[PDB]
Amino acid sequence: FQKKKAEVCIRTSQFKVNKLLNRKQFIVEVNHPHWCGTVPTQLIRKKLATLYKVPDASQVSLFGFKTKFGGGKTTGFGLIYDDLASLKRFEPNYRKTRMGFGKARLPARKSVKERRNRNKKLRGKAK
């Protein structure tokens, strides 16, 4: 054993440019020996930003990772769009909400179900 600062190196396996939806899609595997815990998605986002030279580091989209048994590495899917305005357009709301910017959650669906059943009786401008 020899103590050194825990280094993250990052690798992209099967890369694809998607001219539809305006993005570059791929799976990204992170090797993190001597790391403590799991690498955060935010820290993978900036290091994948430098490797592809994207102008804004927040236009990278990184969702579900699966850490390998035994440790040492993770592997998840990656998305980098041509524009950040294209990111807010084509990403789902749940991946936007995990990036901060996104629509706040609707009222609980059990409430909107009951109100809509109450309005089935009415006719005028009351509903």
């Binding site: 054993f1 048994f69 035994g70 440790g71 040492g72």
Partner: protein, 182 residues
């Protein structure tokens, strides 16, 4: 309810549960290979029984038949791959001569005893299950892991284990905390 994930049984209990000849052989096999229960022997029975049954069907089939050239070269391939048969044994009549200790020698509990990484076969089963042995820089925590022939070269201590190049384990580390408060 609409779930189509499959599952079957891997072992079978013997007919005649009290045979004094059988009960003596299986206590030797639990001692010479460090086994938890008789059920780990009984799946090695069913693993080898299924090989002994398919290879006995293929000998009913003639040579230069399609189901014997294909799928008879598959069962000789997995014996050579997992160390069940050495490379001279290529005639398919040697699968009918395989024994239960021929399969039990290929478990990761046995090779870690035979390669020399542990003093006893009960030392090997502890060190597998306590995350010390990596087969191909892959920490394997399963004692019934059947080691291939090509995997024998690369069994070593894990790179994250305290016995390898990892951080020191619990009894040193909780002692290193007690010497720190003083």
């Amino acid at each position: 309810m609409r779930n189509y994930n499959n599952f079957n049984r891997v072992w079978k209990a013997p007919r005649r549960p009290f045979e004094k000849e059988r009960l003596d052989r299986e206590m030797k096999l639990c001692g010479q290979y460090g086994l938890r229960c008789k059920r780990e022997i009984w799946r090695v029975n069913m693993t080898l029984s299924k090989m002994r049954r398919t290879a006995r069907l293929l000998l009913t089939l003639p040579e230069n038949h399609p189901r014997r050239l294909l799928e008879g070269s598959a069962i000789m391939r997995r014996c050579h791959e997992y160390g069940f048969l050495d490379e001279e044994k290529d005639k398919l009549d040697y699968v009918l001569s395989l024994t239960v200790p021929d399969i039990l020698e290929r478990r990761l509990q046995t090779i870690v005893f035979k390669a020399g990484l542990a003093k006893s076969v009960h030392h090997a089963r502890v060190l597998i299950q306590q995350r010390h042995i990596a087969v191909a820089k892959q920490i394997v925590t399963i004692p019934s892991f059947i080691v291939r022939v090509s995997s024998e070269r690369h069994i070593a201590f894990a790179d994250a284990s305290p016995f390898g190049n990892g951080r020191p384990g619990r009894v040193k580390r909780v002692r290193a905390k007690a010497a720190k408060r003083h």
